[PDB]
Symmetry: C4
Subunit: 23 residues, 4 copies
């Protein structure tokens, strides 16, 4: 489903952004 695929991409992006914000 596009919703689950989009949320999966966004979840991976969120971790990337959060790690970068903390560092």
């Amino acid at each position: 489903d596009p919703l689950v695929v989009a949320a999966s991409i966004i979840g991976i992006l969120h971790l990337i952004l959060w790690i970068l914000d903390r560092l």
Copy 2:
């Protein structure tokens, strides 16, 4: 087709939106 996965998908998108706004 799982309502929990659908709900958690919406919530995950909302979480990123809220977190970006909080940081900016």
Copy 3:
């Protein structure tokens, strides 16, 4: 899949805890 169920629950819990942290 128990993994996707668990990540769904953890994702919901994560948003709740983070909102309460921000408040």
Copy 4:
């Protein structure tokens, strides 16, 4: 069981672990 969903599930669990630890 899509590899993308499996990876994002693992990453979402890791994200909660890391975030709790950081806030502590």
